[PDB]
Amino acid sequence: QETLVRPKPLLLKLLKSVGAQKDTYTMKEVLFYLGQYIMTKRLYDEKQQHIVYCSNDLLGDLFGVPSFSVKEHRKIYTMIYRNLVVVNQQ
């Protein structure tokens, strides 16, 4: 997923909050950093670890849902892409 991408301020700070530097990422990098954010903030359920809690987290504001499952791949990519701007470039 080499899609060249520039997050909107809120996703961007979400990513920067766990140490990302740039304004301009591949989709791959975004996914790496987003998974890290979720683990670093301890948003995943301990027992059913595909479940992610977003209530009173920043992640809830971006995604507009209180919880979601990582198994919902299309929904996940939809909720990401619409916090994201696709550049006119590789």
Binding site: F32, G35, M39, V70
Partner: peptide, 13 residues
């Protein structure tokens, strides 16, 4: 069980 990390890796890396 499956780790969250493992679930997340399946999204696409």
């Amino acid at each position: 069980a499956t780790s969250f990390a493992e679930y997340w890796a399946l999204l696409x890396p």
